[PDB]
Amino acid sequence: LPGLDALQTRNALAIIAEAKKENVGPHGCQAAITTGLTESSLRILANNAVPPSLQYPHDGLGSDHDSIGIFQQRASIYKDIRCDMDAACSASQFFKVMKGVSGWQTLDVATLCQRVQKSAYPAAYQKFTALAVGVCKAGGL
């Protein structure tokens, strides 16, 4: 997919397929891809502060609080570690929260990412929104 390496691509393809399953369209796909790029560079990251995360396949390690997976979901909040460590399932968790945001379908993508993620660094998402448009287009959204 444009602008991604092969490892990022396998993760993005799983996210895109889940976006289609959940019927969230280009806009929803863009929010998930932007978020994954921003949080993990589209990598399923385990975390030694969340020991069960190490039992699932992972692309690398992260050391941000108790965040795990592509979306850096905090294990104290998103307690299903297996789900957090799966590209599609972790994306589904993102999409379900996203769909609770009134007007998500047209809300500025970087803003929407922040509504879902409650990041300390909301401006960070803006760096990846343009790339996300292209990734999602290439994937059929």
- Report how this structure was experimentally obtained: X-ray
Q: Compute the distance between CA of residue 101 and CA of residue 114 in angstroms, rounded to an integer.
A: 11
> Domain for residue 22, yes or no?
yes
SS3 16: helix
This PDB structure is determined at a resolution in Å of: 1.1
> Domain for residue 131, yes or no?
yes
> Domain for residue 50, yes or no?
no
What's the alpha-carbon Rg for the chain, to the nearest Å?
14
> Domain for residue 26, yes or no?
yes
> Domain for residue 55, yes or no?
no
Structural domain boundaries, residue 95: 6-44+87-138
| Per-residue b or e along 37-68, where b marks 16 or more CB atoms closer than 10 Å to that residue's CB | bbbbbbbbbbbeebeebeebebbeebeeebbb
Domains of the chain: total: 1
> Domain for residue 65, yes or no?
no
Asked if residues 141 and 20 have their Cβ atoms less than 8 Å apart, the reply is: yes
Q: What angle do CA 15, 16, 19 make, to 5 degrees?
A: 90
> Domain for residue 51, yes or no?
no
Nearest to 136 by CA among 12, 6, 5, 8: 12
> Domain for residue 63, yes or no?
no
